[PDB]
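During the second half of the funding period, the structural biology subgroup turned its attention to how the target accommodates small molecules. The most pressing case was guanosine-5'-diphosphate, which had performed well in the primary screen but for which no bound structure existed. We therefore specified the complex as follows and requested a full 3D prediction, including the ligand pose.
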Amino acid sequence: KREHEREVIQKAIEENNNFIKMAKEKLAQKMESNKENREAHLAAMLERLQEKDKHAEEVRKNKELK
Amino acid sequence: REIVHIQAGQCGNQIGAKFWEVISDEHGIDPTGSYHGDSDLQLERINVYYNEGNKYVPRAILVDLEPGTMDSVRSGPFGQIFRPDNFVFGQSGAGNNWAKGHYTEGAELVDSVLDVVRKESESCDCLQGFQLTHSLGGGTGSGMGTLLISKIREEYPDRIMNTFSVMPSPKVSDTVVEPYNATLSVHQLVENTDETYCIDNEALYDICFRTLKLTTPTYGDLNHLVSATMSGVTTCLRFPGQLNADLRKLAVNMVPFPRLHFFMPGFAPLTQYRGLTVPELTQQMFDSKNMMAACDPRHGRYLTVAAIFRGRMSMKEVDEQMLNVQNKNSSYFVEWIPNNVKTAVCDIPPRGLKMSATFIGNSTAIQELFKRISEQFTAMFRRKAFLHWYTGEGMDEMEFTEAESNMNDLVSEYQQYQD
Ligand SMILES: COc1cc([C@@H]2c3cc4c(cc3[C@@H](Nc3ccc5[nH]ncc5c3)[C@H]3COC(=O)[C@H]23)OCO4)cc(OC)c1OC
Ligand SMILES: Nc1nc2c(ncn2[C@@H]2O[C@H](COP(=O)(O)OP(=O)(O)O)[C@@H](O)[C@H]2O)c(=O)[nH]1
Ligand SMILES: [Mg+2]
Ligand code: NA
């Protein structure tokens, strides 16, 4: 009977810990995924703008050519 | 033959506190522990529940997972009489979870309590065994109480274990999960108690509401019937007489089979200046409406029965009444147990009554009580309702299943012999 008593309470301990663990990991995954995503978006908007800058340089070179 | 009293949880601590007050009065002990009784009878067996500046101290250990209940007792009239070191409580509380008491938050304090018990048991010249008070349907006394019983049994496997267990009732309920706690407690007791006085918080109400005509009985009301019943059963132990009952002999004579150690208390006069007649006391004593368990004796059969009449009265007339009852009600008495009923008379009457009668019966009808609890458990357990509060502590449905089953077996056993 005493062992089972020690088993129950250790089970409840391990239950709580496991929850805290899973919680911590999940939050860490979602923070990094979001962070990557957001930076990607920003990096693509910047690259589009840079490609528009190059087109303007080329338009300026086309006029100079004539 | 000292008796180590032990009270756990709110209910357990409240009823136990009155019990001490009552028996202190009868034994002429005031709150300070000093004695002023006019008769030596009072001091003749006072050591059964007291230890002696020529002051008697109750041999009681108070146990709770929250200070509140124990602090009230300390503030109570006899709060002084209780030994301060015997006060033993924590701060977590048991949130009404057997688990929280029998597993999680009790395993701590239990050791502390076992130490006081050990100290009381050492001083005791001949330890008769242990007396416990608790509410089977709560958290500290339901769960932690049964845990202390198990611990106690391991340390003192040669001592009698007796519990005044307060069966929970829908009429007087605190939480939906009270059936669960009761079923677990029931199975603990089935195995680790030699004697269990089932005091249904239901009946008490009824009595109060109906008979005593109290529309809104409070817990004090019920407790008042409880203290009286307590003094009754404990009379033969407290006061000297022809039958110096003891826990072991009490078990030897009323328990035909171990599992069947659950008794229906009964008291009369259910409170008055008109002392009842010996016939009156005897008809009320066996009256259903005077039993503290909410079971009909007529629906079952008395394995064994024991009566006590306190107060000045005709011993012969007493014996005549008892004989009449048995003869008129022969069908309600098991034939296989010859002479299954016995009576005893004490000269000192209960406090404020010219004479009273206390009834202790091992009736197969007691199964009604366990059937009620089992149905409740079944209702919720079929849908696993509220079980997360226990699974969170580390318990497992299987354990609920087992306890449910055992209580059903016990119900079956009472019926078998009934028929
Ligand atoms: C109602 O009164 C009481 C009776 C008892 C039981 C008891 C219970 C019984 C019974 C007989 C006896 C009786 N047994 C006994 C013992 C020694 C004997 N020696 N010589 C004869 C003799 C007889 C009691 C004397 O001691 C007990 O503890 C016993 O019949 C069926 O149920 C305990 C009590 O305490 C709670 C008590 O108070 C209320
Ligand atoms: N007769 C009686 N029953 C009580 C009392 N206090 C609580 N109860 C019952 O006890 C059950 C709840 O248990 P509780 O006392 O709160 O146990 P705890 O966790 O250890 O305090 C409920 O069914 C109430 O019916 C009391 O003072 N007298
Ligand atoms: Mg409570
Ligand atoms: Na803790």
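Two results from this model are relevant to the next phase. The first helix of chain A runs from residue 2 to 65. Chain A touches chain B at residues 1, 5, 7-13, 15 (CB under 8 Å).
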